[PDB]
Amino acid sequence: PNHPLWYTLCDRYGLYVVDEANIETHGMVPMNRLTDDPRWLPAMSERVTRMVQRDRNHPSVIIWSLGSESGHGANHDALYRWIKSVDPSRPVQYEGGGADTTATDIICPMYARVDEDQPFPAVPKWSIKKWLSLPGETRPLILCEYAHAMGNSLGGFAKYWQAFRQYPRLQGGFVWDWVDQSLIKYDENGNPWSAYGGDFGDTPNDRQFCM
Amino acid sequence: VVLQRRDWENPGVTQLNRLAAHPPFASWRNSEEARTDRPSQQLRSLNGEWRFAWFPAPEAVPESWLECDLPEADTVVVPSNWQMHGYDAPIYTNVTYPITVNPPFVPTENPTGCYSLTFNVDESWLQEGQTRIIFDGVNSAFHLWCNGRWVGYGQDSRLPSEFDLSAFLRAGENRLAVMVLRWSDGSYLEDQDMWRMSGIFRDVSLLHKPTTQISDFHVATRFNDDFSRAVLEAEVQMCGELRDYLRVTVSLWQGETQVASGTAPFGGEIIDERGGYADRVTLRLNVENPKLWSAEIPNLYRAVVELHTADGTLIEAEACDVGFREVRIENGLLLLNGKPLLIRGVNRHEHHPLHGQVMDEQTMVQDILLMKQNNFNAVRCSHYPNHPLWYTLCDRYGLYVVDEANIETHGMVPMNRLTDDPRWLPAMSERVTRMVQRDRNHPSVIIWSLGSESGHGANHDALYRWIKSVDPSRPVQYEGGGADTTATDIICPMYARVDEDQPFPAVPKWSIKKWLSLPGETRPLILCEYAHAMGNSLGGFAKYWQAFRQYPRLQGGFVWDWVDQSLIKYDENGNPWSAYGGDFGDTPNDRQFCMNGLVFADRTPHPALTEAKHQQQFFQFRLSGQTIEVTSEYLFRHSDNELLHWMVALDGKPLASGEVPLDVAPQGKQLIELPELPQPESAGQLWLTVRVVQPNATAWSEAGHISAWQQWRLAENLSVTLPAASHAIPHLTTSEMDFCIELGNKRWQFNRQSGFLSQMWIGDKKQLLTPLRDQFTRAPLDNDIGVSEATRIDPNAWVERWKAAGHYQAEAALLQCTADTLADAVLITTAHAWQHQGKTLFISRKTYRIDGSGQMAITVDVEVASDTPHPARIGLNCQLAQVAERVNWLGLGPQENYPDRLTAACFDRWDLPLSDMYTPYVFPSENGLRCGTRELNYGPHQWRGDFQFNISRYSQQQLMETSHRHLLHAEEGTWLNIDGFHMGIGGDDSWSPSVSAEFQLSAGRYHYQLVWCQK
Amino acid sequence: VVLQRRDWENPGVTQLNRLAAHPPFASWRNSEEARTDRPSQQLRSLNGEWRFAWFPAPEAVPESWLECDLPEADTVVVPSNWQMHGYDAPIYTNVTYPITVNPPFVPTENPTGCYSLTFNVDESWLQEGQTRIIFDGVNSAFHLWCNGRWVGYGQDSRLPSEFDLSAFLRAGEN
Ligand SMILES: O[C@@H]1[C@H](O)[C@@H](O)OC[C@@H]1O
Ligand SMILES: O[C@@H]1[C@H](O)[C@@H](O)OC[C@@H]1O
Ligand SMILES: [Mg+2]
Ligand SMILES: [Mg+2]
Ligand SMILES: [Mg+2]
């Protein structure tokens, strides 16, 4: 969840917002170790319920999100249903555990490609055109993250837009991402320079991956 | 820290340092022991003599108690509830909380139980592995110390709390100190209608697990389309250091035969981008033609889970009983192994009249044997998870179980105040999730329940969905918020009626037949609670069973409930008596509302039990000519321990009888043609009675057990022969005050001022202590009083309508009294009006015809004002001077039966001691009636006609004036109530009028006739 | 009790004495101010200059800090991340946790930021009504004291944590 003023601004300037619970357990092995564990349900629920309680009157928020990169656990399913009872007015999405689980109203993969399948075991990233028509699948597909803009990037961006325009159920997505997470440091002459991971003696770090 | 934090006033803190929940563990270090389920040296019981001291609050507990035994403390048995030892009073309240409603706060005066145990720990236990303590049940919150060091804290009275004591224990002598709080924030979710108690009331134990251990395991069984192939899937989780040499073997045993086995290293399939569970493995075993589990045939296998090294060293074994069955809902029907269930269920609280809420094997086994002997196949854990042995026993004996989370917030306003509050979701989720984690491997549990009477809140929806993701094998039900919310797979109302709508705003109880077909509705309907068996009850029971059999989607229900919650108190002479709400100084209380059982606290049946057994029969009967059609309602078994016994009798006199072996396929039919019947000599009605008898004993019944029965009227030959003419003729004697009739030794006296037979003689011995008078009232049943809360004086209740109309204080005003002399008889004619405050309620017109034979023919015609509430009865009563040992009758019996509860009674010649003609309901009321009676014999008297009667040493007046059965005293002689007509008893619920129209005395004009004579 | 409990190593305790969550409030006492979204005199900002002192662990915080400013403390702007003031290093890691994976436990060396503010409260706030404090974002967990007395505890870095201070406040300087 963001600074309160963000929603006010999006309400007034006009931006659709996906409001996302502060839950990410990416580093767990496997990724759902905590989110499938009933002992973590209370800490998890507070992160979801207190978000909804805070932001549910903002017109800009059109979609609720259960968080990011925490696999798919039973806690997700419980919290999905909690939102659906409490606030039927907005769809709930969540990418974890394969982007098309029972905890999401929207097929919301990250970095699924337009035409090329990436058949990873358990959590494949189908071509978004193919994903739509898998046997029994009926939901819309909006990419929660796509077109990783790291450095000299965004090659093949037009391919996504052509597909979005041709397919009714391909309804767009969210680029990753808006702003480089570089921080200012100063050299000996007091001159500013953009720093990334490692430049603060931080180790282990992931270098330029923050940009 | 402990007194400062006040964890018992914070729903955010429901435990500290408590271990994860799991299925029953024993940590066998021998695989054969695991297989046979023999005792484990690694699981020790700490039950027995503990030390105990009571305190008014936790602030009053002295610090010394953490290290040293208190001298003022007593030695008590554990498990126990401390109320049962007399330390404070048990409280009986129904809806209203026993504490001020101020969540999450409890009273500053909070009864505190200080338990302590000095015990020995072997050195072997502390050298290696893990030593944990298990508390199966502590009510309602507690802190734990070991050797003076704080260990942890726990809430939820009905699930086990486990703590690791490895770092707290020393070799030799150790001391536990447990501070149990009566009230906590947990109490807001424990507002079940039952005795409010506290203490360490379930087993305490010590378990030793190795460092590398089985930490969890789940068993699933799935099938092909015709159940000829199954796959057993066992997921096993470990704790400790991961090692390549580690293996799990799961083997499946049918008796002493191993049918299947699988072994695999740890490391599950890939789950997501980060891999899989390196600490888990899933074994899949193929099973051909599995023997399926059901309540009809509780086929069980044994699964043994061995944790071991590849090269063959066993680290430990866990095990469980496995029943192969599929529970699913399809096309609106609840199916077990592909077949639609018909639930013959009952709600059962954990209650003992001496030990309170502490359960024991003997009581448990007793309860199960009685349920199965009375044709129940299902039980609901109302309203909390049970003692762990209950499930084992239900697995083994065969009963379908509804396992229910310990969540009830009935006293909240509105009922969902907490269950709709996200701040209560953690406390609620632990009560659901830890139940599921404990009981998921028991085949007997077929349905999960989210709790009881807590309205419907979003927390219910979240937790409904949690169970569905974690355990797809079982439907989830929940009644709150209208019985058909999005948090239930099954429409599960309480006390919805068969044909009658009860259209309460927001939460109506539709007629169950109507409910099924409401626009858009497709689910099955099984009543979570129906037929409230409070006192003299279960009227209209047959109406439920008729609808269950006719409608596919009406799949039965659970009677409320199994056993009266009466407790034992002792009088001045040390004699035991049954007590209910208020009898312990407890106030506010809800009195006798704790007694709704089909059986008494000591497990003696109420008469209603036989009605339940009969309606729940598994064999149905039709008769066409001399052909009996038997239909089986079993789904899985053949009738392979069943013979039909038939009997034909003429007004009680046996004319023919035989027996035919039953040979019926499940859901099938069998035709039995009776042999040619001999023609009856004398007049009267022939009756056919058939009984299904089990020739061989079973795990649950003795040889000769009667499981089903039915009766029919066959040929009737009406008597056309006139009585032989008498030589004698009775003489009248008139005075201004009396009419006296005389014939030999027999004499009758009619009082001319009152208009009733005041006396009668045989020899010169008086026969009456009170005149023969009309009676239009009964000592009100619990259903007539119709209150569920002590404070609700309801004007709509039957008792209140009768009271306000003046039925109980109406006075007979004589309208007519005349005598006449006929050729062979004296004829007395009378008329009375019954009046209250200028209003005529009833008029009774009679003729007494006494003839030369010695017989008095009483003809009664009654008018009942149409605008007065329908009377409870229309008959006569008197107090006979004679007390005899026996009562002999030709009518319905042998047990108590009323017009809406008489389907189980059989017409025959019955003969019982006088005491059996009174039913000792703890709260006394009209009782012991028998209907369809053509003849009654008591001492020298005989009555003939077509009537209903009760006979006992207690007047209707005493019964209605005495609140407890033990306070009753045998009056002089015998009170007789002979009714031409009697109102139904009702019972669909006990807090609103529940007697159906067809059983109300509303015909306005009534006629009956009786013949009184000597034998 | 606060050190002995280690509430920051227990996922069962995510807060103590925290008020319920709700949509943005200003408690306007004038309808027209509410309509126009103009400032409310019942909603005060405590943003600006606070006192701050860094510690290697919660165990290193001296008890004197509860009642008295520490001479060694610096004056810093709030809101702020203390890494952006040079007190310790910000860490950039993607997937791999910045701490050893051992739930619910954290490192014993756990950088601790001790913030304090001396502030004044209006007279009429003390006699009547309810005064709460609102922390919109605190990363990642915190205990709160007012005038030496413990108020509560809160987790989740990205939502407001609110506490009733009505009973804790005194006339003048708090
Ligand atoms: O209180 C008991 C039960 O728990 C409730 O649901 O129905 C009434 C019964 O007597
Ligand atoms: O709903 C019924 C009634 O409202 C209560 O007073 O008694 C228990 C029963 O459930
Ligand atoms: Mg608590
Ligand atoms: Mg209740
Ligand atoms: Mg915590």
Ligand code: NA
């Ligand atoms: Na599109």
Ligand code: NA
């Ligand atoms: Na990045």
Ligand code: NA
């Ligand atoms: Na049915």
Ligand code: NA
């Ligand atoms: Na009751």
Ligand code: NA
């Ligand atoms: Na009575």
